[PDB]
Design a binder for this molecule. Sequence first.
Ligand SMILES: C[C@@]1(c2ccccc2)OC(C(=O)O)=CC1=O
Length: 283
Amino acid sequence: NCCVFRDDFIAKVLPPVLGLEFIFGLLGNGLALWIFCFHLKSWKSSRIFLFNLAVADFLLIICLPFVMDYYVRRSDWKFGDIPCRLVLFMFAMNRQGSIIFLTVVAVDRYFRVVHPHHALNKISNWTAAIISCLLWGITVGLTVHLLKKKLLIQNGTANVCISFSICHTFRWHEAMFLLEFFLPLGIILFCSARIIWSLRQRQMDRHAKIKRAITFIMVVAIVFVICFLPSVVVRIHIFWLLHTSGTQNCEVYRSVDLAFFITLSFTYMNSMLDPVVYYFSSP
Ligand SMILES: C[C@@]1(c2ccccc2)OC(C(=O)O)=CC1=O
Protein backbone atom coordinates (compact mmCIF):
# COMPACT_ATOMS: atom_id res chain seq x y z
CA ASN A 1 0.00 0.00 0.00
CA CYS A 2 2.81 2.39 -0.90
CA CYS A 3 1.99 5.93 -2.02
CA VAL A 4 0.88 5.69 -5.66
CA PHE A 5 -1.50 8.11 -7.30
CA ARG A 6 -2.19 10.21 -10.40
CA ASP A 7 -3.42 13.68 -11.31
CA ASP A 8 -4.89 15.50 -14.30
CA PHE A 9 -2.49 18.46 -14.41
CA ILE A 10 0.37 16.16 -15.42
CA ALA A 11 -1.81 14.85 -18.26
CA LYS A 12 -1.84 18.47 -19.50
CA VAL A 13 1.96 18.77 -19.14
CA LEU A 14 3.73 15.46 -19.75
CA PRO A 15 2.00 14.28 -23.00
CA PRO A 16 2.82 17.57 -24.82
CA VAL A 17 6.27 18.06 -23.28
CA LEU A 18 7.40 14.45 -23.66
CA GLY A 19 6.06 14.27 -27.21
CA LEU A 20 7.77 17.53 -28.17
CA GLU A 21 11.11 16.28 -26.80
CA PHE A 22 10.78 13.10 -28.88
CA ILE A 23 10.59 15.07 -32.13
CA PHE A 24 13.76 17.01 -31.34
CA GLY A 25 15.48 13.94 -29.91
CA LEU A 26 14.99 11.81 -33.02
CA LEU A 27 15.95 14.56 -35.48
CA GLY A 28 18.95 15.63 -33.39
CA ASN A 29 20.60 12.38 -32.35
CA GLY A 30 19.41 10.57 -35.47
CA LEU A 31 21.19 13.05 -37.72
CA ALA A 32 24.28 12.88 -35.49
CA LEU A 33 24.52 9.11 -36.00
CA TRP A 34 24.30 9.67 -39.76
CA ILE A 35 27.46 11.80 -39.76
CA PHE A 36 29.40 9.41 -37.52
CA CYS A 37 28.67 6.32 -39.62
CA PHE A 38 29.02 7.70 -43.15
CA HIS A 39 30.66 11.15 -42.94
CA LEU A 40 33.45 10.75 -40.35
CA LYS A 41 36.54 9.93 -42.43
CA SER A 42 38.83 9.42 -39.41
CA TRP A 43 37.70 7.66 -36.21
CA LYS A 44 40.05 8.82 -33.45
CA SER A 45 39.86 7.93 -29.77
CA SER A 46 37.99 11.11 -28.82
CA ARG A 47 35.23 10.56 -31.39
CA ILE A 48 34.67 6.99 -30.15
CA PHE A 49 33.48 8.13 -26.72
CA LEU A 50 31.20 10.74 -28.29
CA PHE A 51 29.68 8.05 -30.53
CA ASN A 52 28.57 6.03 -27.50
CA LEU A 53 26.96 9.15 -26.03
CA ALA A 54 24.70 9.46 -29.08
CA VAL A 55 23.87 5.73 -28.98
CA ALA A 56 22.70 5.96 -25.36
CA ASP A 57 20.51 8.99 -26.10
CA PHE A 58 19.07 7.33 -29.22
CA LEU A 59 18.22 4.20 -27.22
CA LEU A 60 16.25 6.46 -24.84
CA ILE A 61 14.57 8.60 -27.51
CA ILE A 62 13.26 5.52 -29.33
CA CYS A 63 11.55 4.48 -26.07
CA LEU A 64 9.88 7.89 -25.63
CA PRO A 65 6.70 6.92 -27.59
CA PHE A 66 6.18 3.91 -25.31
CA VAL A 67 6.25 5.93 -22.08
CA MET A 68 4.18 8.63 -23.80
CA ASP A 69 1.37 6.11 -24.31
CA TYR A 70 1.45 5.41 -20.56
CA TYR A 71 0.11 8.86 -19.67
CA VAL A 72 -2.49 9.07 -22.45
CA ARG A 73 -4.26 6.05 -20.94
CA ARG A 74 -4.79 8.01 -17.68
CA SER A 75 -1.64 6.43 -16.22
CA ASP A 76 -2.44 2.87 -17.28
CA TRP A 77 0.02 0.27 -18.59
CA LYS A 78 -2.52 -1.33 -20.90
CA PHE A 79 -0.07 -3.71 -22.60
CA GLY A 80 3.34 -5.13 -21.76
CA ASP A 81 3.06 -6.70 -18.32
CA ILE A 82 6.50 -8.32 -18.66
CA PRO A 83 7.81 -5.61 -21.06
CA CYS A 84 7.13 -3.19 -18.17
CA ARG A 85 10.40 -4.37 -16.63
CA LEU A 86 11.99 -4.30 -20.10
CA VAL A 87 10.77 -0.79 -20.91
CA LEU A 88 12.07 0.40 -17.53
CA PHE A 89 15.41 -1.43 -17.73
CA MET A 90 16.01 0.27 -21.09
CA PHE A 91 15.36 3.64 -19.40
CA ALA A 92 17.67 3.49 -16.38
CA MET A 93 20.43 1.90 -18.47
CA ASN A 94 20.21 4.72 -21.03
CA ARG A 95 20.13 7.39 -18.31
CA GLN A 96 23.07 5.95 -16.37
CA GLY A 97 24.94 5.07 -19.55
CA SER A 98 24.62 8.65 -20.78
CA ILE A 99 26.05 9.97 -17.50
CA ILE A 100 28.99 7.54 -17.60
CA PHE A 101 29.89 8.60 -21.14
CA LEU A 102 29.27 12.25 -20.19
CA THR A 103 31.93 12.19 -17.46
CA VAL A 104 34.38 10.25 -19.66
CA VAL A 105 34.36 13.02 -22.27
CA ALA A 106 34.91 15.60 -19.53
CA VAL A 107 37.72 13.46 -18.11
CA ASP A 108 39.14 12.98 -21.61
CA ARG A 109 39.12 16.73 -22.25
CA TYR A 110 40.82 17.32 -18.89
CA PHE A 111 43.79 15.12 -19.85
CA ARG A 112 44.28 16.96 -23.16
CA VAL A 113 44.70 20.46 -21.66
CA VAL A 114 46.27 19.87 -18.24
CA HIS A 115 48.51 16.92 -19.20
CA PRO A 116 49.29 17.49 -22.89
CA HIS A 117 52.19 15.01 -22.91
CA HIS A 118 50.40 12.18 -21.09
CA ALA A 119 50.34 8.81 -22.84
CA LEU A 120 46.57 8.56 -22.33
CA ASN A 121 45.98 11.12 -25.10
CA LYS A 122 47.53 8.80 -27.72
CA ILE A 123 45.55 5.60 -27.14
CA SER A 124 44.61 3.76 -30.32
CA ASN A 125 41.05 3.14 -31.50
CA TRP A 126 40.94 -0.40 -30.29
CA THR A 127 42.06 0.55 -26.76
CA ALA A 128 39.33 3.20 -26.88
CA ALA A 129 36.83 0.44 -27.75
CA ILE A 130 37.91 -2.03 -25.04
CA ILE A 131 37.46 0.71 -22.43
CA SER A 132 34.14 1.75 -23.98
CA CYS A 133 32.86 -1.84 -23.96
CA LEU A 134 33.80 -2.21 -20.28
CA LEU A 135 31.95 1.02 -19.48
CA TRP A 136 28.79 -0.46 -21.00
CA GLY A 137 29.35 -3.52 -18.83
CA ILE A 138 29.16 -1.57 -15.57
CA THR A 139 26.05 0.26 -16.81
CA VAL A 140 24.01 -2.96 -16.74
CA GLY A 141 25.68 -4.01 -13.49
CA LEU A 142 23.69 -1.38 -11.59
CA THR A 143 20.59 -1.71 -13.81
CA VAL A 144 19.92 -5.42 -14.48
CA HIS A 145 18.45 -5.72 -10.97
CA LEU A 146 15.25 -4.20 -12.38
CA LEU A 147 14.49 -7.50 -14.11
CA LYS A 148 14.76 -9.55 -10.91
CA LYS A 149 12.25 -7.46 -8.96
CA LYS A 150 8.54 -7.81 -9.69
CA LEU A 151 6.70 -4.79 -11.06
CA LEU A 152 3.31 -3.51 -12.28
CA ILE A 153 1.59 -2.95 -8.95
CA GLN A 154 -2.16 -3.36 -9.43
CA ASN A 155 -4.42 -0.64 -8.02
CA GLY A 156 -7.44 -2.92 -8.18
CA THR A 157 -7.91 -2.72 -11.95
CA ALA A 158 -5.27 -0.23 -13.11
CA ASN A 159 -1.65 -1.00 -13.98
CA VAL A 160 1.28 1.32 -13.22
CA CYS A 161 4.87 0.67 -14.33
CA ILE A 162 6.64 2.80 -11.71
CA SER A 163 9.77 2.03 -9.69
CA PHE A 164 10.20 5.49 -8.10
CA SER A 165 7.30 5.02 -5.67
CA ILE A 166 7.43 7.04 -2.45
CA CYS A 167 7.71 4.14 -0.01
CA HIS A 168 10.02 4.05 3.02
CA THR A 169 12.59 1.40 2.08
CA PHE A 170 16.36 1.30 1.54
CA ARG A 171 16.03 0.59 -2.17
CA TRP A 172 19.20 0.32 -4.24
CA HIS A 173 17.49 2.01 -7.20
CA GLU A 174 16.65 5.11 -5.14
CA ALA A 175 20.13 5.25 -3.60
CA MET A 176 21.80 4.82 -7.00
CA PHE A 177 19.64 7.71 -8.25
CA LEU A 178 21.62 9.98 -5.90
CA LEU A 179 25.10 8.54 -6.51
CA GLU A 180 24.65 8.79 -10.29
CA PHE A 181 24.61 12.61 -9.98
CA PHE A 182 26.63 13.68 -6.93
CA LEU A 183 29.74 11.69 -7.86
CA PRO A 184 29.96 12.99 -11.47
CA LEU A 185 29.49 16.53 -10.13
CA GLY A 186 32.69 15.98 -8.16
CA ILE A 187 34.51 15.04 -11.38
CA ILE A 188 32.84 16.92 -14.24
CA LEU A 189 32.91 20.25 -12.38
CA PHE A 190 36.47 19.74 -11.13
CA CYS A 191 37.77 18.78 -14.58
CA SER A 192 36.00 21.72 -16.24
CA ALA A 193 37.47 24.07 -13.62
CA ARG A 194 41.08 23.27 -14.52
CA ILE A 195 40.43 23.32 -18.28
CA ILE A 196 39.03 26.86 -17.96
CA TRP A 197 42.04 27.72 -15.77
CA SER A 198 44.97 26.08 -17.57
CA LEU A 199 43.85 27.70 -20.83
CA ARG A 200 43.93 31.04 -18.96
CA GLN A 201 47.15 30.65 -16.94
CA ARG A 202 49.13 29.95 -20.12
CA GLN A 203 47.63 33.08 -21.78
CA MET A 204 46.20 30.90 -24.57
CA ASP A 205 42.74 32.38 -23.98
CA ARG A 206 43.36 35.79 -25.55
CA HIS A 207 43.89 36.44 -29.27
CA ALA A 208 42.65 33.03 -30.39
CA LYS A 209 39.51 31.16 -31.42
CA ILE A 210 39.95 29.04 -28.26
CA LYS A 211 37.60 31.48 -26.50
CA ARG A 212 34.75 29.55 -28.13
CA ALA A 213 36.24 26.29 -26.84
CA ILE A 214 36.39 27.67 -23.29
CA THR A 215 32.80 28.89 -23.65
CA PHE A 216 31.46 25.43 -24.52
CA ILE A 217 33.30 23.80 -21.62
CA MET A 218 31.05 25.84 -19.31
CA VAL A 219 27.98 25.24 -21.49
CA VAL A 220 28.31 21.49 -20.93
CA ALA A 221 28.36 21.99 -17.16
CA ILE A 222 25.36 24.33 -17.34
CA VAL A 223 23.30 21.82 -19.33
CA PHE A 224 24.22 18.95 -16.99
CA VAL A 225 23.27 20.92 -13.87
CA ILE A 226 20.00 22.21 -15.35
CA CYS A 227 18.91 18.79 -16.62
CA PHE A 228 19.71 16.65 -13.56
CA LEU A 229 19.90 18.78 -10.40
CA PRO A 230 16.15 19.64 -10.09
CA SER A 231 15.23 15.94 -10.18
CA VAL A 232 17.70 15.14 -7.39
CA VAL A 233 16.69 17.95 -5.02
CA VAL A 234 13.04 16.85 -5.17
CA ARG A 235 14.09 13.23 -4.59
CA ILE A 236 16.05 14.20 -1.46
CA HIS A 237 13.01 16.20 -0.32
CA ILE A 238 10.94 13.00 -0.41
CA PHE A 239 13.60 11.27 1.71
CA TRP A 240 13.13 13.96 4.36
CA LEU A 241 9.44 13.12 4.83
CA LEU A 242 10.25 9.42 4.41
CA HIS A 243 12.78 9.47 7.26
CA THR A 244 10.82 11.79 9.57
CA SER A 245 7.10 12.65 9.67
CA GLY A 246 5.89 10.22 7.05
CA THR A 247 5.33 6.61 6.02
CA GLN A 248 1.79 6.93 7.41
CA ASN A 249 -0.01 9.83 5.69
CA CYS A 250 -0.07 9.84 1.89
CA GLU A 251 -1.31 13.44 1.54
CA VAL A 252 2.08 14.99 2.34
CA TYR A 253 3.58 12.82 -0.41
CA ARG A 254 1.10 14.06 -3.04
CA SER A 255 2.86 17.36 -3.75
CA VAL A 256 6.42 16.02 -3.92
CA ASP A 257 5.60 12.87 -5.92
CA LEU A 258 3.75 14.87 -8.58
CA ALA A 259 6.66 17.32 -8.76
CA PHE A 260 9.19 14.46 -8.89
CA PHE A 261 7.31 12.70 -11.69
CA ILE A 262 7.14 15.92 -13.71
CA THR A 263 10.73 16.89 -12.85
CA LEU A 264 11.85 13.55 -14.28
CA SER A 265 11.10 15.06 -17.70
CA PHE A 266 14.21 17.21 -17.25
CA THR A 267 16.34 14.08 -17.70
CA TYR A 268 15.10 13.34 -21.24
CA MET A 269 16.06 16.92 -22.16
CA ASN A 270 19.81 16.31 -21.85
CA SER A 271 19.35 13.59 -24.50
CA MET A 272 17.96 16.33 -26.77
CA LEU A 273 20.44 19.17 -26.13
CA ASP A 274 23.47 16.86 -26.39
CA PRO A 275 23.68 16.84 -30.23
CA VAL A 276 23.21 20.63 -30.28
CA VAL A 277 25.98 21.30 -27.75
CA TYR A 278 28.41 18.40 -28.14
CA TYR A 279 28.52 17.32 -31.80
CA PHE A 280 26.92 19.97 -34.01
CA SER A 281 28.53 22.98 -32.33
CA SER A 282 32.06 21.63 -32.70
CA PRO A 283 33.57 21.79 -36.24
C1 LIG B 1 8.49 7.70 -16.40
C2 LIG B 1 9.27 6.39 -16.39
C3 LIG B 1 8.71 5.33 -17.34
C4 LIG B 1 9.55 4.61 -18.17
C5 LIG B 1 9.04 3.65 -19.03
C6 LIG B 1 7.68 3.40 -19.08
C7 LIG B 1 6.83 4.12 -18.26
C8 LIG B 1 7.34 5.08 -17.39
O1 LIG B 1 10.65 6.70 -16.75
C9 LIG B 1 11.43 6.35 -15.69
C10 LIG B 1 12.87 6.62 -15.92
O2 LIG B 1 13.11 7.67 -16.66
O3 LIG B 1 13.74 5.90 -15.44
C11 LIG B 1 10.76 5.83 -14.63
C12 LIG B 1 9.35 5.80 -14.97
O4 LIG B 1 8.42 5.40 -14.29
